[PDB]
Design a protein around this ligand. Structure first.
Ligand SMILES: C[C@H](CS)C(=O)N[C@@H](Cc1c[nH]c2ccccc12)C(=O)O
Ligand SMILES: [Zn+2]
Ligand SMILES: [Zn+2]
Ligand SMILES: [Zn+2]
Length: 234
């Protein structure tokens, strides 16, 4: 499209799509959290005559709105979804996807952490991702576990046909110059995990953060700078 949508343009309950490349879209929703309102991104990837979804739209109502906007703008069925960590902006709405016939997936690490926290639990388990540096194919994407960062279970997703790297909540947009929610983070390991991403995907052309505006590979160095400033807080 043209301009990327912002919190001021999406009332809570609605969802926007944004085309990144041929067969690749982000989805954008908003939610209230501890008095503020935040935007949040996921991904959609064309999979033959079907669609692969990356992450929910942060809640049941938003995720029903996401399915309806996919039918309006694309018109192909969502058959599988992957959640990239255990927080509610990634798994909240999994029950809506399941009731609609979507097969929901996450690593065994994510499924366990979601159950402890009381969040919705994806049905299927992704094997082969428990060690830092592990990668597996999942149809038109590669899934990568870079090590602990924003959370101990965070995954990143690469679309090779389009050179699109989806960083999720391990990667910060440029406008964010201070750290956000770090309660579940590994601050000591986060920079090393970002370096694994840079070394595995040096050809990436578009980088999509979990919250806010897309950019390029500069977002990886940016995130390192912000994490190290938080580590050195007074
Ligand atoms: C609910 C999500 C689950 S990831 C969370 O708890 N925190 C997020 C959201 C966030 C915090 N500050 C911001 C400042 C600007 C934009 C987004 C944010 C994070 O830390 O990136
Ligand atoms: Zn999170
Ligand atoms: Zn998030
Ligand atoms: Zn920066």
């Amino acid at each position: 499209s043209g301009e990327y949508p912002t919190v001021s343009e999406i009332p809570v309950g609605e969802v926007r799509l944004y085309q990144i490349a041929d067969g690749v879209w982000s989805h954008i929703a908003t939610q209230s959290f501890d008095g503020a309102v935040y935007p949040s991104n996921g991904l959609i990837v064309r999979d033959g005559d079907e669609l692969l979804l990356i992450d929910t739209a942060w809640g049941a109502k938003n995720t029903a709105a996401l399915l309806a906007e996919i039918e309006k703008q694309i018109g192909l069925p969502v058959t599988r979804a992957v959640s990239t960590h255990f927080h509610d902006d990634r798994v909240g709405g999994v029950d809506v996807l399941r009731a609609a016939g979507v097969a929901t997936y996450a690593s065994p690490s994510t499924r366990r952490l979601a159950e402890v926290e009381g969040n919705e639990i994806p049905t299927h388990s992704l094997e082969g991702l428990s060690s830092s540096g592990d990668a597996v194919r999942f149809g038109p994407v590669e899934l990568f576990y870079p090590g602990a960062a924003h959370s101990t279970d965070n995954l990143v997703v690469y679309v090779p046909s389009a050179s699109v790297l989806y960083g999720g909540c391990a990667i910060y947009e440029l406008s964010r110059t201070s750290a956000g929610n770090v309660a579940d983070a590994d601050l000591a390991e986060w920079p090393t995990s970002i370096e694994r991403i840079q070394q595995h995907y040096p050809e990436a052309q578009f980088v999509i953060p979990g919250h806010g505006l897309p950019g390029g590979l500069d977002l990886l160095k940016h995130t390192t700078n912000v994490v190290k400033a938080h580590t050195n807080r007074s």
